[PDB]
Design a protein around this ligand. Structure first.
Ligand SMILES: CC1=NC(=O)N=C(C(=O)O)C1
Length: 160
């Protein structure tokens, strides 16, 4: 039965059948999760540009990298950002289904440099749940912060 799990570690060392990059719409290497991903899978950045609110898969050998572009909340209104954040996750679910993978390593989109300085753990995680609930893949969420690890775990546990 497919599960949700959380791991506090570098997403570039995931043990899943594909990864989601928290990407920018320019397809450029960038900072944080995107930097790790670039160093691990540089060939997945060939023609990886995709607009805000979308996701695009680029293969690195046979390993799929799903570049998903959450909104930068600095730029977006709360209502328009929320729409785009939801859309990005929906496109992730679609790519995951099309690939036929049994598992996916995913970050919380729009929670770091794109958070607009707000805590958006709950907002982002709930959009992730809504989209990925219709898939049969194991989902592993990767975070860096110990407190976030606990709150994500609690949110996972409380739906069971
Ligand atoms: C480049 C980024 N894209 C994204 O979806 N979320 C980000 C974040 O703030 O975690 C950064």
């Amino acid at each position: 039965a497919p599960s949700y799990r959380v791991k506090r570690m570098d997403i570039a060392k995931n043990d899943e059948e594909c990864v989601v990059n928290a990407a920018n719409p320019r397809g450029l290497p960038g900072d944080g999760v995107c930097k790790a991903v670039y160093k691990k899978w540089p060939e997945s950045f060939k023609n990886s540009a995709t607009p805000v609110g979308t996701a695009k898969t680029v293969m690195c050998g046979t390993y799929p990298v799903i570049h998903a572009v959450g909104p930068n909340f600095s730029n977006y209104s709360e209502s328009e950002g929320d729409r785009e954040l939801a859309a990005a996750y929906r496109e992730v679910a679609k790519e995951v289904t099309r690939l036929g993978v049994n598992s996916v390593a995913i970050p919380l989109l729009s929670t770091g440099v794109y958070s607009g300085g707000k805590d958006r753990l709950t907002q982002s995680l709930n959009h992730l749940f809504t989209a990925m609930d219709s898939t049969d893949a194991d989902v592993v969420i990767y975070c860096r912060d110990k407190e976030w690890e606990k709150k994500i775990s609690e949110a996972i546990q409380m739906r069971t």
